Design an enzyme around this catalytic site. Structure first.
Site, short mmCIF file in Angstrom:
data_model
loop_
_atom_site.label_atom_id
_atom_site.label_comp_id
_atom_site.label_asym_id
_atom_site.label_seq_id
_atom_site.Cartn_x
_atom_site.Cartn_y
_atom_site.Cartn_z
CB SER A 103 -0.87 -0.05 1.27
OG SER A 103 -1.69 1.05 1.48
CE1 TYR A 128 -4.33 -2.38 5.03
CE2 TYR A 128 -3.76 -0.06 5.07
CZ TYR A 128 -4.06 -1.20 4.37
OH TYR A 128 -4.08 -1.16 2.99
#
Ligand SMILES: OC[C@H]1O[C@H](O)[C@@H](O)[C@@H](O)[C@@H]1O
Ligand SMILES: OC[C@H]1O[C@H](O)[C@@H](O)[C@@H](O)[C@@H]1O
EC number: 1.1.1.233
Lengths: 255, 255, 257, 255
Positions: free
Chosen positions: A137, A150
């Site tokens: 990401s 996360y």
């Protein structure tokens, strides 16, 4: 086809990016195992035929599913590790042990376990280089608010990717990461439609919109094909300019 | 003194960088708790007096030690999270679940648990901003060979650091990472003395030598003092030019 | 004693916000300091601390003259802070003129090159290596681009890489080289920097600390990178931006949304 | 063909990477102008037919050549800015004004002038997004010894690329950089054959060899094709793991 005759495993294959990757891989001529949770595989249709569904759960289940998958393909040339939990929790001050453990276990340890099993199978099968592709990401490099678990795990995946590239180069395997920005997985343009969120996408993404899963999958084809033979330890960022820009809300057309 | 009257906790306080941080903090006027394993604290002397030793083990033990420490200081202004396992395992292909778990649990989860406990105590004590300082590594950005678990966890610490900075800014707490390169902790110039390793330090570090713990501790003072009030989410790299240079073995004086 | 006691320092851009704050911090920490900037700008500056040696300069012959002059007056050179810089936007890249490109590249990049080469040469002539120190002032724009400022942005990337290259080449000569990368900094002195409403809103969204920095918050890093204890730090960047470069979707955070 | 019917200009088209880009573009169906110095174009033969040679000199010559090129193509969809001087000078202490000026003028200002002219022609032609691809280097991020001017200019190109991406997103143009590591352009494996240099390539590149121009050209195809529609302001690094690894000389197989 750019992937003609290659054996591929795609994890998280019922999710947006994973599904789009299965479809692109099938169109480019690969034999593909689609791995995800059994109930999620049950409820997915692929736009392209030929996908071999194999249920799994992101340790014994991962080894079983991977052996099963390699058995059915008769080899392994490409692994896309796309299984991942994406979500925020709240402020760091209130982050529980249980939420920390779930994101770290599933995103980080799950990726480790899948990639080790896959790398071992690629070497057993005689790894032209084999290819491991991790889905990280923009959060592997810059933090969103209220998602510390996360975010941390995405940093772990980014460095896991580099370490794997270094250690597996001698074994004929190239390893790289794809780092998407905002991606609409809903299928009906309702991702990122909350008004404040929509405004912030307009400010922070130079293209002024979320990406589509297909715009991510194309990099997965590029990093798996024969011509990408000098690319390893790197990241392809697919974020509409998000990580390239600061003060995007001040630009002509926005202010 | 630049830290006069501030309460500080330093974890990994019997190790090279942690010990040097305790000493620098005491010289600059802070009240300091030194936290590490009981047997390791037993076998350490500090060059400066005033350190409050508190035994701990990098979850219940971390919360106990932290409450104990904050009780003894009467507050908390600065936390240095230096507890860490540093070591390589072998090639990624052969990395066991047990080594993966140990590095991730100790380096990443341990840092998470320490920092959450500390951030919570800083807010309870009325956080001038309080300061959390994490000890990462150049391995938070670039991978050494045969150390994939250590490397992955260092990437997780780097991103955990940025996520904390984002979430704790509203709570009056600044969060930054120190990223050392090679550091000789032996005390007798024997770190990095293996011949092949010595040659590689000469090639890869522009200064041509390992650093000393004291050359890292100075950054911990800088990031804890009042003047550093606009610095958060950043990394101070202390590596003799290692991360800045490529093909260092070709430079004048080396080739 | 003072952290910089008895060191000779040159600070360029010394009439500007960060340069002025650097001169002051350096003087308070015991250094002998030459303040270099344009003559008319030096004419119109007062320093909060006494002892600054004013030397007029213009960001090539001008730079060599000023630097020789400066080193002559200090009797050596231990620290150089290259802070001379044009900061400004032009408009969209499509419309950027050759003249604006040339001015930013010439002043920010070539000017920094010329100042640093002259300084490094004087540090070696004076017996560097305790290491001498060169500190460059870049920007968060050395790494991420603001809109409508392509020339400024490109030149800041050039300064960042010039810094790393100098660190590699001058390590053998006893000189450490590092960059300071500030985010938004209010130089006005009266909290009116970043006051335009849309701009103020974007500072709240993008900077985790929710405000611009002050020049003094940057100058502290210039002290840190110049002192004896920073002896293993080279080729690196200290970013001072209130979390700007660390955060994405900051407008969605608790307290903002 | 992945680029079927698109108009492309490739600068530095008589050099290794530029030549390989012209060839890949022609194979994938593009109409291609190959731009370089007249004498260099005179002495090049392309492995694929259809290239339109246009002489140029990396300001009036650039505008003339670009207008000429756009006239002949009847549009402009893709620009690859590959014109570049690559070379070292000596130590920074001894770097002359003349060498500084040549690298900055040719690599940086030349890339600026080419890209502005191209972007203007893309908008005039009705920019599916048009595509600008810049050729930087690993030296855009990390410095090789004794090449400070080249290195500085590569950092300028990197940030010029990000700035162009931000400003031209509203005009329908995506802008990205390719960052190659060591690339053998000789055609007979004699690049990087100097013994000390060969040893350092083995240490620093995980794949243990230089890349070939064709391994770079493949990224230029990827970044020019329709599917790369959410990629802008990014870098594709093609360096065999060079930028991903530290202490590579200590790895298994090398030590
Ligand atoms: O819009 C993109 C931009 O968001 C910010 O303001 C910054 O924190 C950067 O990290 C990022 O590039
Ligand atoms: O100098 C050692 C060198 O290792 C590599 O070649 C690179 O990854 C650089 O980051 C580093 O500086």
């Amino acid at each position: 086809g750019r992937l003609a005759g290659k054996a591929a495993i795609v994890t998280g294959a019922a999710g947006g990016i994973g599904r789009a990757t299965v479809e692109a891989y099938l169109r480019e001529g690969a034999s593909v195992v689609a791995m995800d949770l059994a109930p999620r595989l049950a409820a997915t249709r692929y736009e392209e035929p030929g996908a071999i569904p194999i249920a799994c759960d992101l340790r014994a289940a991962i080894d079983a599913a991977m052996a099963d998958a390699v058995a059915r393909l008769g080899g392994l040339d490409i692994l896309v590790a796309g299984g991942a939990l994406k979500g925020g929790t709240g402020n760091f001050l209130d982050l529980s042990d249980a939420d920390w453990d779930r994101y770290v276990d599933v995103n980080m340890t799950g990726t480790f376990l899948t990639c080790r099993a896959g790398a071992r199978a690629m070497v057993a099968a005689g790894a032209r280089s084999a290819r491991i592709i991790t889905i990280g990401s923009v959060n592997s490099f810059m933090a969103e608010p209220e998602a510390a678990a996360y975010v941390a795990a995405k940093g772990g995946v980014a460095m896991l990717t580099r370490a794997m590239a270094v250690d597996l180069a001698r074994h004929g395997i190239l390893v790289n990461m794809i780092a998407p920005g905002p991606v609409d997985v809903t299928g009906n343009n309702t991702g990122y439609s909350e008004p404040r969120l929509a405004e912030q996408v307009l400010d922070e993404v130079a293209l002024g919109r979320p990406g589509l899963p297909e715009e991510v999958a194309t990099a997965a084809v590029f990093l798996a094909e024969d011509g990408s033979s000098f690319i390893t330890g790197s990241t392809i960022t697919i974020d509409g300019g998000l990580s390239a820009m600061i003060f995007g809300g001040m630009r002509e057309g926005r202010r």
